């Protein structure tokens, strides 16, 4: 079912986050949203904040239906470090390793993720078609 497939897809992504990305050494700056009381300037600069806790919350809500949408938020972590800390900051080097281990692990699971992504997309289109046919009955 689309529910079993979304659960599987989300579990794979969550395991990539907790077992690989969160395990990158010294990755603590990216585990949670920046606290405005600690870094008030952060939210004057960073318009689209992102972090690994927020990604996990999004996974639990089944936000990500595709590898692309998942990686959109993953890359935001890196892009935001480039902007706030600079492209050569040690913070950005760490964010880069987080992104790289994400890519590496996605590649290991690309066969299964690609199939889940396709099957979720077909089931979603079918449910949309049926809902529209029912509303017009």
Q: CA-to-CA distance for 104 and 33, rounded, in angstroms?
A: 24
Per CB under 6 A, which region of 3-11, 16-24, 35-43, 121-129 contacts ligand VJM? 35-43
Based on the shown chain and the rule CB under 6 A, indicate whether residue 84 belongs to the binding site for ligand VJM. yes
Nearer to ligand VJM, 51 or 117 (CB): 51
Cα(27)–Cα(21) distance, rounded to whole angstroms? 8
Closest CB to ligand VJM among residues 8, 79: 79
Asked whether 73 and 55 are in contact (CB, 8 A), the reply is: yes
The two counts, helices (H) then strands (E), for the chain are 6, 0
Residues 64-83 close enough to bind ligand VJM by CB under 6 A: 81
3-state helix vs strand vs coil in the chain, percent to 5: 75, 0, 25
29 part of the interface to ligand VJM, by CB under 6 A: yes
* Residues forming the site for ligand VJM (CB under 6 A): 28-29, 31-32, 34-35, 38-39, 42, 81, 84-85, 91
């Amino acid at each position: 079912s689309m529910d079993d497939d979304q659960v599987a897809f989300s579990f794979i992504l969550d395991n990539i986050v907790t077992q690989k990305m969160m395990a990158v050494p010294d990755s603590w700056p990216f585990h949670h949203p920046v606290n405005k009381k600690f870094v008030p300037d952060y939210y004057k600069v960073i318009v689209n904040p992102m972090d690994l806790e927020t990604i996990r919350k999004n996974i639990s809500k089944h936000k990500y239906q595709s590898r692309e949408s998942f990686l959109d938020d993953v890359n935001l972590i890196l892009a935001n470090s480039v902007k706030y800390n600079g492209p050569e900051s040690q913070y950005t080097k760490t964010a880069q390793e987080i992104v790289n281990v994400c890519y590496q692990t996605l590649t290991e699971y690309d066969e299964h993720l690609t199939q889940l992504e396709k099957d979720i997309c077909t089931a979603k289109e079918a449910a949309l078609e049926e809902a529209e046919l029912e509303s017009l009955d």
